Every structure is written in C-alpha cells, then in structure tokens.
Amino acid sequence: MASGIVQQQNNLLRAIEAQQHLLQLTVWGIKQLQARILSGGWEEWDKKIEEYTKKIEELIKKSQNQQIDL
Amino acid sequence: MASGIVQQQNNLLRAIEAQQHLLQLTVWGIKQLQARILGGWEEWDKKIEEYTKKIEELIKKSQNQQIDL
Amino acid sequence: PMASGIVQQQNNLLRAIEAQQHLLQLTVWGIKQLQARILSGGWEEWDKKIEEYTKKIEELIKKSQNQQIDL
Numbered sequence: 717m718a719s720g721i722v723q724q725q726n727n728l729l730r731a732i733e734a735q736q737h738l739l740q741l742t743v744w745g746i747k748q749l750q751a752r753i754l755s756g757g758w759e760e761w762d763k764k765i766e767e768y769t770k771k772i773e774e775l776i777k778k779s780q781n782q783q784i785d786l
Numbered sequence: 787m788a789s790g791i792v793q794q795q796n797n798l799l800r801a802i803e804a805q806q807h808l809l810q811l812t813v814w815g816i817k818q819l820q821a822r823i824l825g826g827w828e829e830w831d832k833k834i835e836e837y838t839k840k841i842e843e844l845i846k847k848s849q850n851q852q853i854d855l
Numbered sequence: 856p857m858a859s860g861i862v863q864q865q866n867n868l869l870r871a872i873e874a875q876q877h878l879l880q881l882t883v884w885g886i887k888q889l890q891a892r893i894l895s896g897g898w899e900e901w902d903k904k905i906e907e908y909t910k911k912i913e914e915l916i917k918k919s920q921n922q923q924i925d926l
Contacts, residue, residue, distance in 0.1 A: 717858055718788075720926050724865050725794050727919045731872050732801050734912040738879055739808055741905055745886040746815040748897065753822075761815060768808045775801040782794045786787040788856050795864055802871050809878055816885040830885060837878040844871040851864045855856055 729779050736772055743769075792855045799848050806841055813838075862926045869919050876912060883909075 743765060750758055813834055820827060883905055890898055 717926070720922065721791060721858065721861055721865070724919065724922045724926060725791070725798065727915060727922055728798050728865065728868055728872065729801075731869075731912055731915040731919060732798060732805065734908055734915055735805060735872065735875060735879065738905070738908045738912060739805060739812070741901065741908070742812050742879065742882050742886060743808075745890065745901060746812060746819070749819055749886070749889055750815070752893075756818065758818070761811065761818075764811055765808070768804055768811065772801060772804045772808060775797060775804055779794065779797040779801060782790060782797055785793075786790050791861060792856060795861060795868070798868055802868065802875065805875060809875060809882065812882050816882060816889070819889050820885070826884075826888065830881065833881055834878070837874055837881065841871060841874045841878060844867055844874060848864055848867045848871060851860065851867065855860055855864070 726783070729776070732779075733776060736776065739772075740769075795855065796852055799845070799852060802848075803845060806845065810838070862923075865926070866923055869916070869923060872919075873916055876916065880909070 887902075
C-alpha cells in the first residue's frame with residue numbers, strides 16, 4: 717500500500733513533467749505565430765509566461781526533492 | 787514517512803494549479819491571434835470553457851481533500 | 856492520515872491531469888489552425904514533438920490508471 721502510493725506519486729509527477737514539456741511546445745507555437753506580426757498585451761503576456769514557467773519548474777524541482785525527504 | 791507523502795500530494799496539486807494558469811495564458815494567446823482574423827472556433831470556445839470548468843472543479847475537490855489529510 | 860484519503864485524492868489529481876491533457880489538445884488544435892495559414896521550418900518538427908509527448912503522457916496516464924486500480 718505504502719509503496720504503491722509512492723509509486724503512484726512518481727507516476728503523477730512524470731505525467732506532470734510530460735505535460736509541462738507539452739506546454740513548452742504550445743508556448744513556442746504561439747510565440748512563433750506572434751513573431752509574424754509586424755504591425756497588444758503580448759509584452760505583459762510574455763512576462764506572465766516567464767512567471768508561471770519558472771514557478772512550475774520550481775514546483776517540479778520541489779516535488780523531485782521531496783522524493784528523498786523521508 | 788507519512789508526513790512527506792501528504793507533502794508530496796500538496797506539491798503535485800500546486801504544480802497542477804500552476805500548469806492550469808499557464809494553460810489559460812496559452813488560451814488567451816490563441817484568442818488574441820484568432821481575434822486578428824476576418825468554422826470550429828465557436829465550438830472550440832465551448833470546449834475550452836467546458837474543460838476549464840471541469841479542471842477548476844477537480845482542483846477545488848483536491849484542495850479541500852488536501853486539508854482533510 | 857488515512858491511506859484511503861491519499862488514494863482518494865490521487866484519483867482526483869489523475870482526473871485533473873487527464874482533463875488538463877484534453878484542454879492542452881484543444882490548444883494544439885487552435886495553434887495548428889492558425890499555422891495552416893502560413894504559405895511561406897520548425898513546424899514539421901513541432902508536429903513530431905507534439906505527437907511524441909502526447910503519446911508519452913498518455914502512456915503515463917494509462918500507467919497511472921492501472922496503478923490506481925492496484926491501490
């Protein structure tokens with residue numbers, strides 16, 4: 717039971733990690749399309765993207781560190 | 787250590803919350819680019835809202851139960 | 856801290872991840888639709904990598920489902 721729960725936590729984190737890598741790709745796609753515009757809130761959007769990207773990366777790192785905190 | 791397992795459940799949830807914020811930022815980005823146009827987009831709005839409502843419900847459920855732990 | 860409580864919540868986290876995955880696939884649809892308007896380069900490789908990780912997380916989701924049943 718205890719090992720199964722831990723194993724499930726490990727599985728969930730990996731799904732989250734894979735979700736994030738999948739998020740990184742979607743962000744690239746939007747920024748690539750936005751770069752075509754030569755002629756509106758993107759500068760604030762850019763900062764929020766950087767904001768939550770870092771926050772997620774820390775939470776993933778924190779989750780990884782928790783695996784050895786027993 | 788069952789003090790870490792509760793903590794790890796909290797960590798995953800927070801990561802999920804933050805990834806939901808990032809997802810919503812991507813939705814805004816798509817809608818911005820889409821607004822520069824002029825099928826699908828009306829239905830796309832409906833399904834974006836639908837699953838956003840579904841995620842927000844599951845997060846609330848997970849948050850409350852995180853406290854019961 | 857009942858073990859059934861953690862297991863219960865792990866089910867929700869999994870359901871949340873599954874729902875967020877469906878939301879993400881809806882965003883991929885939106886991007887590809889806008890990208891299709893380009894007639895002028897990363898996008899062929901972008902498709903390959905969206906494809907690669909979509910399958911990868913789906914494996915992890917399926918693996919999480921079968922673990923959830925073993926709990």
